[PDB]
Amino acid sequence: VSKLSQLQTELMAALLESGLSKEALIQALGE
């Protein structure tokens, strides 16, 4: 999880910065 957790976290941050919408997030939460 270290490397995995770090990858997930940095990916999420980049995604948000790229403009990932609240709608995408909400959809993700429903999965």
Added chain:
Amino acid sequence: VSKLSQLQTELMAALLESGLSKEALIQALGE
């Protein structure tokens, strides 16, 4: 956005499959 949207979507899907938690998602929603 095509390529960008497609990248975001596929990245999210992979993230979820890797075990991205509800807690991470919720944190993301608060940003």
Added chain:
Amino acid sequence: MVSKLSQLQTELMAALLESGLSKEALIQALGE
């Protein structure tokens, strides 16, 4: 034999390539 981390790496690279990642970027990465 394939961990969650490896699988995520694989999928991420695939998505990167599809998005148009260039050979140059790949070359630079190799130089790291």
Added chain:
Amino acid sequence: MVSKLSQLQTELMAALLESGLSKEALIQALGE
């Protein structure tokens, strides 16, 4: 000059490398 897509590509590659992406994986990607 750097689009959101390019920037995301850059950050994703950086994160991939940090996670331990191998040279072999990079070689294979180049062969695509």
